């Protein structure tokens, strides 16, 4: 298999059996618990890369079920998202995620630049409560709870939420340890169909961990909680600022 | 978190809590079981990317324990390695690995370009038999067996095998899915101390898997088995050929 | 809170974190097993409150799954309902009900006046059989079985039955133990969308219990068994008769 | 079953097999662990309904075993009680309670107006520590600890709290959702026999929950811990303010 | 229970509580994993009953979930199907099935003449991998694997495959052991709705069993893998050739 | 494999690997618990096909262990048998059976016409009591008990019992749902050797089930109980009345 | 414990509590499953020690239950036996055994010279299938399967096979590692009673193991399967050829 | 024993079988996790006994494995130590300690006067994370985490810290409950050989407990985390201050 055949088939490692596939990336029945909390503004500023700019000092803490995902399989995710502005546009910055499936973890990192690590997220209804949890090894680092579907939420506002740009700092080292890729990436979730969306009382507790430091954006006050189910496509991202 | 802080600080994602640290990457008490088997030369040719050239039509099947790994932790690995020459120099090519710990998986892939996937390798003595196994979710894909330290091995010769260059094909996608990095990488294991090294009868059985195709290189005849324990440093690789 | 705003805010206890929310109460994919059986006429007459009037001497024994219930969560229900007339108008009377979730138990009792107790109902397919059970603590008190979807059920008869009036006897003691509320309440399930509906052969065995006396309406003869899945709204009730 | 006989028979639903019976409600060998903690005064006034007034800014956090309870069975309970005055008379206000047995749950709510919800309270000695815990489904929302009977308490003093009035805001919705009952209820625990009472160092930790917000009253400092066993009759309450009259 | 009641009522044994009901036999959400493999043409010829003629020397190995099956219940199936022509028309031939539910096993055999035996098929997503397995008592006889929904399939073409005739050889013994029924049966799946259809890499391993000889058709090379979900009606078959 | 080869090898499906084999059918160490009870004569008449004629209004309820059975393996059985007369001959009619092994269940139905279904029978001594049970899925449908070997029974009378003809209504649908086989079948158990045979106090309890309606022949009074162990051969049956 | 007591008392170590007793070695109810398979004649030649000569290129693979064995206890065995001739006489050669009980392992090896190792053989009926398996620590190395007593076997012929000489190569090392005993040993099974003997379809799968190389004689085609139960006496062997 | 020899023999209770032996007390492969955190100065001042003097307001929280401890066995330890000065001399004060082995608990208390209580500390690598925990009965009261060996730690600073003086407050009541012993004790760890020593990012969460009040020194800010393995001798102490 010649030089140009290699260059032509190359998408992801291993060449002949890639750790992940090309898309499209389609998600069916994504289920979100999102708890939004006020935090120390100084705690966001210490972690937000310029030229991104801080908006509200809030954090979106999320627990996501992805039972049906092309190329990737059946998995769950938990993460911390921060509202930002970039060039007059509102959007989000993903600071941290954790997932229980390989292909979307390698794929997430190597293709888009999602800052993903391994963990055990769960999101399930126990009788009357929706309970989100994320373990990292034997250690519980996040527990969220919500009432069950108390109020229907505005679906227009939700679709506008899912339409905003999502920014990521993609960093990949060169063989020598210096960055070979260091860029702000913009991605969109498109073809959204909302199956249901609700609000209800919510709660969040975070625990410190040396290798999963979600707790360094302290929960000062829980502001809102939303729970929705939707289908969508994770579109390929585009570079919006190349630090290199 | 100023703009040029980012491009000088950036090593691995997440920028502020990297998924793996910089080395040196030191390994104490790695333990190897290596079953060398003869395969179909045509299966080797099918996967070998030029300018690499095949040598003997053999596969070195590895089960490796790494209980003490700087920056990475305590874990196990299994994989398929093939003798190769590049520009006439004899070395190795790593076709497939599987590991049970995320930092060395991401780090292996993003820094050197080891072709790593997730799986559950084990290497254990069960009374009279050293047993290596590799499971990928609920499916067994590799089982190797060895008698226990039947005869001491010529260490000076072994250390020779371990001085040879190891070659990797590093592939990282750009955000749009075309290759952003596509290169052959040369790396050495250095500062090696062999604590012991043995030979004994060996066996190997492989099973098909859509996502872990080790059985694509069929075990036609087992040729040798080696078992050894060592400390070593995984040095950073160099680019020896850039396809882009 | 100010004495005035307390009145304005009061819905259910606890005032500041009510044991159940207001609604509307929407149900998605309720799944029913109903076994209609002939019983002793005298047993029915002994429990039916005038001004309610007995229609035929049958009991509909229900096993219901409610996997998706707004404000309540995900739960199961079992109990006894009797065909009734009130002022000439054909309807049903709920004698006993059993649930494994507390918000719909309190809310059922305090809002509409469903005669609810705690219990563990289950409704599950085991290979070829739909099996309904009700345990009350360690004692099984109801076991129902049906074949799986032998014949389509008349959607029109079904929708007309669901459109009927349901009567409940709401009783709530005053702090002195005398009745503070004692009324016949009429309610409706509306916005009914049936997803599937079948008949099959069916069985029912009931067992004695001092605190869960379903067996007091003995199974003389099983008349029919229906299985259906639907979405509906549990509308608020209205008082049709005040004993006080 | 004539409509007249219906009215005569009516106490609690279901008419012919009430979810709970009538009393008298007797409790034998009721065991308490009470951790008193100072909280944020602003947290208390937000949840205290006028004409109640606030007394000292503390919360009495409770874990109670009721192994022998007439009409109810054998169960445990946990929750939050605060010091209050109504018309200048000093008493308690129950903010939240959680139990593992339905009859006292329904009865608690529908008769007296106790603010009750389901949960899994436990109270047990583990070697040297009395350990009280509350779980709400999979989530731990309260953990409390004490030494084991370090110092005896005077009982005669203790009975100073048990004879005080207890106040409850009783709320039962009408079929249409607006309040049918909305009154403050006064109840007393009478027939109190103390079998033993003790103090010891204590601890408390509380965790957030959307549906069980005990942690909304933050533990700033633990102030005292008490452990006691008693027999007790829970008397029927009386209305002392009717928001709806 | 008069004599001519018997001959007009008789459908299946036991006459008064038949082991399976009459249809229509409707299936909602059948899920298929099909691994198509090339085999020894001589192994196919050895089992193919004339007047059926072999076509390509391939086997379609199936693992199928049927969670909602009218009259039959919720169950799983695995089996070996071969492309065939009869009187020049292209169709299929079912060589072997295995199921975990009795009504469809007896019903399959006695009505259509599906060559059904007992076993324990499973089809499940394990993170990144769709895994089909078939156990016959304690022995694994089939393991298949697929990546997860790598690429959407041409549905109109699929629906084409599913319009083809399916052929069965129905054999029932007379009480004396000579064949009482011995016929080729043609049946169609009709009213088909494809909910989704995908392709992805595939693997298949078979193991010998004296009583479940799937391995008699050896996996020489895996050619394709398909995964799809559908609703369909299993129509009654017709006799196309009677050997007697 | 030609047309006539097919017709010549055809015994049971699948042609090339029959679900059951030819006999002879030999049973070693068959162990029976038989509880005979008086029932409603109207309950037998509703289930007994003419030209069979009712004898006593009793039912033989049975629990059988078949640990050693040619062609079939190791299994257990439970069933309801009714005494009948046909053409001046005393015999039995089998109304219902349940077994935990496939080959004898398919074989029983397709060859002789035993009205067999699937279930979990057990027959074991627990200390002082012989206990027979039959579950159908998670549901207990029959429990019998006997004292242990209180009295030896008449072996001449027992052999005469095992010598009487056993009648079965064999029904097999045609592909179109109409009966293709509908006949009264007579079979004998021959070559009987009785190893031991006893009577003792006995008891029976039956539970309703929609798909296993053994309970529709109510236990009004337990009359007798016998327990024996024997070897025998289940001879092929012969047609004694063809409804068709 | 005088010097010449030792040389007249000495049978097995420990002298005062020998690891196995002298016989006769009587076996009641040995049960055999034997899968006869054709293999590579070249694999047979590679292991057959002259003056033994190979006969058919077949292996008799055995799984044997010995529940009642004088001096040895209750245990199981599995092994590989090959047809042979010595000085023109047809007999057997035992290549490999594995047992789960020490006295017969030591005794087998030190007295006759059976080539015994440890392992975990099992032979059990699972419903319709006789299943033999052999595990060596955690690795399965042999799985055999048979239908259950399909047809009675010609016993007089069987007893003929069991009258043939069995040959063993006995090897014991001297303290210095050179052979102290190295001889061909002939032994018979005598006083044989066949309790039953059957044939049925068979299967065999072998797996590699460094220390249990049964798979070195590959299953090319399974030829027959036999299942039988017997009592027999293992007589002491004789030396028929002494290499020393 | 004679009254004189009692005095001569007395070391620890029981006289004739002392709860712990004399020593020297040698430790091999102690493994420490130390997390240094800033706390509230007032909390430290509230527990520190004059003549001891407060140095910086930090607490070193320790999780220690002692797998090989002469006279004591194999055990783990957790607790709190504070940087201190005494007469100008820099050292440490041990506030609280927790162990799962009784000989070092009694011996620690009675000989040096370590302030020991019972508890269950653990220190373990879970894949990529070093996890320290302390349970006290059913309550977790300390959880520490570190990355694995990110950077070498300064051996010189380490050895100097281990060479420092440790102070303890030895208190032992007289039978009347008044202090019989009340003294500041100084001790040293000598013959220290460090085997490895590292730093990495670290975390600590503490929890309230009435009998194990570690939380009384609140974690305001984690300053550092060190991991090391060493051999050392726990030398006898000396009194430096007698309160009595």
From Swiss-Prot, chains A, B, C, E, F, G, H:
Claim: Lyase is one of the keywords in the record: yes
Self-association state and partner proteins as the record states: Homododecamer.
Site (Important for activity): 117
Enzyme class: lyase
This protein's name: Acetoacetate decarboxylase
Keyword Transport: no
Active site residues according to the UniProt entry: 116
Gene: adc
The entry's keywords: Decarboxylase, Lyase, Schiff base
EC code: 4.1.1.4
UniProt record similarity statement: Belongs to the ADC family.
GO molecular function: acetoacetate decarboxylase activity
Function: Catalyzes the conversion of acetoacetate to acetone and carbon dioxide.
Entries under HAMAP family matching the protein: ADC
Catalytic activity reported: acetoacetate + H(+) = acetone + CO2
